[PDB]
């Protein structure tokens, strides 16, 4: 895990976007490529679209998602079965 003394890591662009969306009450999906950003408590009610590599995938944040990276909720490899 990242060091506690360094705090969490959220990309500035997404940080600017999330605060504007929450203050304006906007409900439109926030398209982002930032998979390395931790989910701050501020976006608990927002729908973020995170690039899985080829598509932006919709993730509605929930209380249980705080502290996790955004990328965790955007599977990058497609495996259905071997047969």
């Amino acid at each position: 895990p990242r060091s506690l003394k360094k705090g969490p890591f959220i990309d500035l662009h997404l940080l600017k976007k999330v605060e504007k969306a929450v203050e304006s009450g906007d409900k439109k999906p926030l398209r982002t490529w930032s998979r390395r950003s931790t989910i701050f408590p501020n976006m608990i009610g927002l729908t973020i679209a995170v690039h899985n590599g080829r598509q932006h995938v919709p993730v509605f944040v929930t209380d249980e998602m705080v502290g996790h990276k955004l990328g965790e909720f955007a599977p990058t490899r497609t495996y259905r079965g071997h047969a």
Partner: protein, 115 residues
Amino acid sequence: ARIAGINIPDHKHAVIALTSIYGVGKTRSKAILAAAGIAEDVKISELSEGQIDTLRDEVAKFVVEGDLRREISMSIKRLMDLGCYRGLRHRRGLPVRGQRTKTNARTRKGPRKPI
């Protein structure tokens, strides 16, 4: 020798007998013995009824046995329902810590299944 509910420790040294409790390992065991004032090398057989009750109190200060099994189950369960990367890896029974699956992922996949 009925510490932590059903767990029954044996006649073996106390510090190692206490490891039979789910939730207690060697480090915690030594802490139990040190806090309760019983030598680690004594046997549970030789252990006196006054000393055993003290051990039960020192173990109760920890989340062990069925409480741990509920705690562990809730943690795995919340990952799966939440549906993050580590949830899917738990649901599909594949290594959750980034280990290679091309080969050598048996402890998670079980015995080999022929094509």
